[PDB]
Amino acid sequence: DIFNRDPRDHYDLLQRLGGGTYGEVFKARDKVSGDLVALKMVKMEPDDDVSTLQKEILILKTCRHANIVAYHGSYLWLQKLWICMEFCGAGSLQDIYQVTGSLSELQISYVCREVLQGLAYLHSQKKIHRDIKGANILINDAGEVRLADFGISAQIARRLIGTPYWMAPEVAAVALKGGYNELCDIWSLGITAIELAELQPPLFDVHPLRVLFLMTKSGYQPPRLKEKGKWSAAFHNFIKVTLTKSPKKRPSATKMLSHQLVSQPGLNRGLILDLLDKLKNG
Amino acid sequence: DIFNRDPRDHYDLLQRLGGGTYGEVFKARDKVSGDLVALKMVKMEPDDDVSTLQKEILILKTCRHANIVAYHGSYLWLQKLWICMEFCGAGSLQDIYQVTGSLSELQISYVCREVLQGLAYLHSQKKIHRDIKGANILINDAGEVRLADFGISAQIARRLIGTPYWMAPEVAAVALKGGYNELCDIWSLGITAIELAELQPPLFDVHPLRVLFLMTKSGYQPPRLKEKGKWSAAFHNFIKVTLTKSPKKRPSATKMLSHQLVSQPGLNRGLILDLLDKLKNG
Numbered sequence A, B: 001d002i003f004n005r006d007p008r009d010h011y012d013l014l015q016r017l018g019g020g021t022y023g024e025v026f027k028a029r030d031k032v033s034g035d036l037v038a039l040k041m042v043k044m045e046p047d048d049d050v051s052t053l054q055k056e057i058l059i060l061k062t063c064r065h066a067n068i069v070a071y072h073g074s075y076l077w078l079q080k081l082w083i084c085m086e087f088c089g090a091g092s093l094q095d096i097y098q099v100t101g102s103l104s105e106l107q108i109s110y111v112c113r114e115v116l117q118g119l120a121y122l123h124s125q126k127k128i129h130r131d132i133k134g135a136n137i138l139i140n141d142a143g144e145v146r147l148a149d150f151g152i153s154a155q156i157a158r159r160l161i162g163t164p165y166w167m168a169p170e171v172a173a174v175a176l177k178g179g180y181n182e183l184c185d186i187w188s189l190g191i192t193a194i195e196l197a198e199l200q201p202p203l204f205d206v207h208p209l210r211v212l213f214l215m216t217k218s219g220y221q222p223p224r225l226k227e228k229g230k231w232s233a234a235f236h237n238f239i240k241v242t243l244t245k246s247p248k249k250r251p252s253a254t255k256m257l258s259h260q261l262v263s264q265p266g267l268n269r270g271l272i273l274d275l276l277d278k279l280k281n282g
């Protein structure tokens, strides 16, 4: 259901969102219900095909989990594709910690638990987020955690490796799946936990292609937390097991929900309400 | 050896090359020797790192084969990276057949033989071209075939899948190797032969992401030549064996140099001299 209609017939555009870090996203108010939503608008070339997204848009619609950002329908109108999603008034975690500074272990643990619940739901649906990081974890004014859109922000970028028509089936398959297994979101989550702990992912001051070269070496060591004494053993093990080099030995999302760090009691949105208070005042 | 010097100290820029299909490439005359060369200039962000290309520039330099376009040194100067290569006055095959129309089977066979000789050399060096197609096969005024630059035109685009710092080692390795084996250039060559035969690769009028979806299906059929009677059995088999779906059963570059199509006598640059004559006059 991609309503071929001007989205302004249903909603009123209020302001920009994200400051351009996710393209042109808008805070919009529903004329009817009065609710607030988010509208991500993506431009067309127009060499793009609206139907190649159908298999991806059905993915974002059939997601009945509270930790995934809700989807409310799409809109295509004058080479402009508007994705309507649940709004999260606190922005991303990256927006937050760039003001509040580093997060606490308890806050990280709650965010990790909520992200795992969304991942374990996503992987049970045999989907892969592909880009778990601070900027794709949204917070609402209730301090609740929402994974951002996935699979849609990938294809249509819209630029591959080679040239699609001359590619080989092995090259074609890898240009789509990307050598991905669901267990790479677990790695991404471990890097995100380090990101939420140290404001920056490991090797952030290193050129991107360089770090990828480093990760193919047979003696490559997965990253760690810089300050040992600052974090608990549970957090240090959570980083170790999420950052398992071999995907065969890497715990699944559900198995990680059994881990000490995220199954401990006392994890709730209040930890983020503290973080959103440290945002406005302190 | 990336001479940190204004390339105008050595050469004189004459005209643009390719019409923007390879970025800003220049026809340049050597002040000293008087020779003509090509200078591909790529802009810097400058978030790029010049040393990440070192492993790739050594690849383009240690290529002592006549079917690979020669390399003469690089130049970095004011956020501008100038790659100096052997000049090919007839442009690419895509530039040619977009004027001369389709190529003949003999012309395709000669171009395929020469490309295989370069590929078989490239693969013996354990390298992969990754993007074999009409636009990357250059012709000189002698009608000789030259494979264009490879591995350099890939990284620094300079945009990946996910975000490099949060990627997993499996994701990192695939974002670099691309699930590639040397035997995918053979597939690319078969598509190129169809391209040189029909002016367009198979499924050119189909959206790129769509054809990649089609190639992952278990019942996907590799493409063929449209006109059966127009081509010989050797050419039809050459398309079949180069377009082998499983890379395990796909012939290597050397094995393909044994094929009837490219080992037959009578293949020489005269076939392309005909094509370059059909270019200027007819």
Ligand SMILES: CN(C)C(=O)c1cc(-c2cnc3[nH]ccc3c2)ccc1N
Binding pocket: A016, A017, A018, A019, A025, A038, A069, A085, A086, A087, A088, A089, A090, A091, A092, A095, A138, A148
């Ligand atoms: C004022 N403000 C909160 C923002 O500018 C803001 C909004 C988002 C945001 C909110 N909700 C969303 N729903 C789907 C995507 C999405 C993105 C992210 C970062 C931001 N800095």
Ligand SMILES: CN(C)C(=O)c1cc(-c2cnc3[nH]ccc3c2)ccc1N
Binding pocket: B016, B017, B018, B019, B025, B038, B069, B085, B086, B087, B088, B089, B090, B091, B092, B095, B138, B148
């Ligand atoms: C006037 N003319 C021939 C061109 O405009 C032209 C030149 C090239 C070309 C020639 N030599 C090269 N060496 C390394 C890259 C490279 C590219 C390709 C296509 C073109 N239409």
